[PDB]
């Protein structure tokens, strides 16, 4: 199990498990669009 490369494996905003063997850019990419859609700017 050499997976990782991210501070989170599941979007803590919309509770969505991110794809495997992803990259810091992947999680961030979604976290950005999700964050914008979200109403609460909580720090995770």
């Amino acid at each position: 199990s050499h997976m990782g490369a991210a501070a989170l494996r599941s979007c803590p905003m919309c509770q969505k498990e991110f794809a495997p063997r992803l990259t810091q850019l992947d999680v961030d990419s979604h976290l950005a669009q999700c964050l914008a859609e979200s109403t609460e700017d909580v720090t995770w």
Partner: protein, 78 residues
Amino acid sequence: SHMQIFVKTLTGKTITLEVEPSDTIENVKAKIQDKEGIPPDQQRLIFAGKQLEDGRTLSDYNIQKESTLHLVLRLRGG
């Protein structure tokens, strides 16, 4: 010493600006405003799976040179 950083938006646009290690997230948006044309009070930064804000500095998020950051606008009244 001055390091460079990149910030892409949800539209695909790629912004290239420079920032310091002692600077802050809000600062990065200050200069970016004159680039795209958006206020720092609406745009945000995302890196390391964490929400980058004025609450912390660049060195706080280990933001080195050539950092891949994103842009998120959370309109209040709009």
